[PDB]
Amino acid sequence: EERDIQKSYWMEHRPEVLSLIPPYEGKSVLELGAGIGRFTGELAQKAGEVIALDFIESAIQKNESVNGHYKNIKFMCADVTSPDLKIKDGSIDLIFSNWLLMYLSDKEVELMAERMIGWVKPGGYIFFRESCFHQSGDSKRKSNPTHYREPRFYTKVFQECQTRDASGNSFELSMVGCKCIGAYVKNKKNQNQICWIWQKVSVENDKDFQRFLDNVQYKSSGILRYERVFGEGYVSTGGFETTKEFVAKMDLKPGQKVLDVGCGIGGGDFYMAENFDVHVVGIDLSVNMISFALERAIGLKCSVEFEVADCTTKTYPDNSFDVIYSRDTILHIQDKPALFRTFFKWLKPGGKVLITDYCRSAETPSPEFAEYIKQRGYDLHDVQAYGQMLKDAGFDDVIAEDRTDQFVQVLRRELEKVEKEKEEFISDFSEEDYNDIVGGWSAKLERTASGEQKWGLFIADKK
Ligand SMILES: Nc1ncnc2c1ncn2[C@@H]1O[C@H](CSCC[C@H](N)C(=O)O)[C@@H](O)[C@H]1O
Ligand SMILES: Nc1ncnc2c1ncn2[C@@H]1O[C@H](CSCC[C@H](N)C(=O)O)[C@@H](O)[C@H]1O
Numbered sequence: 246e247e248r249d250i251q252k253s254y255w256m257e258h259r260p261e262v263l264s265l266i267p268p269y270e271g272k273s274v275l276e277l278g279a280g281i282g283r284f285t286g287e288l289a290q291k292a293g294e295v296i297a298l299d300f301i302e303s304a305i306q307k308n309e310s311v312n313g314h315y316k317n318i319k320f321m322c323a324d325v326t327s328p329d330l331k332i333k334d335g336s337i338d339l340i341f342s343n344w345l346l347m348y349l350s351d352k353e354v355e356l357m358a359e360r361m362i363g364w365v366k367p368g369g370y371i372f373f374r375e376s377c378f379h380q381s382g383d384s385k386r387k388s389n390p391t392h393y394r395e396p397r398f399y400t401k402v403f404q405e406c407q408t409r410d411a412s413g414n415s416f417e418l419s420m421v422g423c424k425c426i427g428a429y430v431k432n433k434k435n436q437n438q439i440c441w442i443w444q445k446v447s448v449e450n451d452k453d454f455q456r457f458l459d460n461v462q463y464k465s466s467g468i469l470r471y472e473r474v475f476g477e478g479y480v481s482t483g484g485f486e487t488t489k490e491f492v493a494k495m496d497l498k499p500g501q502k503v504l505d506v507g508c509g510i511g512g513g514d515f516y517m518a519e520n521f522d523v524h525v526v527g528i529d530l531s532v533n534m535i536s537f538a539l540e541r542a543i544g545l546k547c548s549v550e551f552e553v554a555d556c557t558t559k560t561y562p563d564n565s566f567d568v569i570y571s572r573d574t575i576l577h578i579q580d581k582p583a584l585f586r587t588f589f590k591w592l593k594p595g596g597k598v599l600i601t602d603y604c605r606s607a608e609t610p611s612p613e614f615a616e617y618i619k620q621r622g623y624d625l626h627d628v629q630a631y632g633q634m635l636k637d638a639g640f641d642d643v644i645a646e647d648r649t650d651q652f653v654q655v656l657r658r659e660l661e662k663v664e665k666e667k668e669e670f671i672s673d674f675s676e677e678d679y680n681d682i683v684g685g686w687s688a689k690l691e692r693t694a695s696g697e698q699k700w701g702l703f704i705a706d707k708k
Contacts, residue, residue, distance in 0.1 A: 478512020
């Protein structure tokens with residue numbers, strides 16, 4: 246039994262947290278797992294009345310020895326899960342705990358959310374703080390029964406919690422805050438102390454609809470494994486480092502307008518807009534790509550806009566853009582000359598096009614390369630011929646560079662990093678995700694080594 250294991254464990258065995266908890270001056274507070282009263286004394290000094298509870302007799306007795314002089318505390322030795330624990334429903338302004346749910350089974354956490362919402366009055370708060378993430382228990386002794394859960398579990402249990410009064414008003418919990426104890430630092434290892442603040446609200450939601458919405462988002466998230474390999478914000482060759490190199494060639498001036506054809510999740514667009522004070526118009530055929538772009542754009546003050554659109558059918562007025570930019574997108578486009586003629590009209594006189602794209606050697610594709618091209622739906626040309634297409638469309642000063650050596654260098658570095666981080670990659674993602682990346686990068690390196698696959702950089706300008 247969980248109860249016996251946790252009780253046995255516990256038988257053998259601050260200003261920041263208080264600053265985080267909802268206002269408690271004058272209020273009715275229930276402290277669960279009070280221990281010897283590290284918080285109890287502080288709470289009581291401002292609270293109207295406190296109930297301090299712990300299932301270890303000696304702990305709660307020590308609490309009473311130290312804090313008993315505060316006459317507004319009632320002390321209880323009880324297990325929070327016990328049916329015999331009697332606390333008047335709707336009587337509590339604030340339920341406070343600090344390390345507690347980690348000592349309950351998964352089903353008991355669900356039980357406790359229900360007990361807690363019952364105990365708190367409408368408009369009241371629940372605060373809890375737990376040690377999270379499985380790896381937090383790697384160095385744990387076999388007889389340490391502490392549950393180090395993924396934070397998503399606590400969020401989901403409490404967001405689905407529902408109850409009724411008599412008769413028969415529905416109540417749920419809204420999430421007021423989720424906070425990292427000691428302040429969140431990006432990429433910082435071992436930040437596992439997390440707290441939540443929930444408020445009891447009058448509402449009846451359909452949890453199946455919420456699960457549906459979350460599941461739609463989860464299904465759309467495959468692109469994140471590619472972002473992991475390329476770099477935050479990027480889903481093509483070389484991430485930020487290649488983007489910085491190529492954007493420099495545009496000579497972007499403040500106030501210019503850039504079209505990004507195949508904008509993906511927007512990282513290159515944020516980079517251009519923020520660093521060069523240009524307006525970027527980004528289009529991508531994928532709803533899911535644009536969803537991430539829009540989300541990462543929230544809060545940014547740079548001038549970017551994103552739309553789901555097919556670049557082969559989208560229309561813009563003549564002379565709309567100073568620059569048309571595209572990275573590893575146009576291999577999907579079957580009629581490049583038509584696309585380029587459209588680019589020529591969209592660009593203002595004096596404008597510029599910059600494209601990187603997958604290409605092939607001039608030689609006829611091997612049967613294996615041809616089948617790959619067909620399955621993927623690609624339209625590949627040699628670098629010189631691609632350049633000629635830009636010339637044919639009316640562009641001047643066409644530069645067409647074979648950058649395959651750079652492509653290979655970048656592929657090798659991208660693959661090596663994933664391989665060296667295999668365990669974490671798999672924990673964050675999955676084994677199948679890891680295999681997809683390693684397999685795909687290995688195959689690209691095979692096709693480059695055979696001499697069949699190429700990578701090109703194209704720059705041209707208009708009149
Ligand atoms: N099911 C349960 N019912 C009541 N108390 C419990 C419990 N499971 C664990 N506890 C108590 O929860 C406390 C956790 S340690 C933290 C104590 C205090 N909240 C503070 O932060 O200082 C322990 O004292 C333990 O005895
Ligand atoms: N006809 C089309 N119109 C617009 N985008 C297209 C398209 N065909 C393919 N794409 C998009 O082209 C993108 C290529 S991946 C690269 C995205 C981004 N430029 C970056 O470098 O990170 C994909 O997101 C894909 O959805």
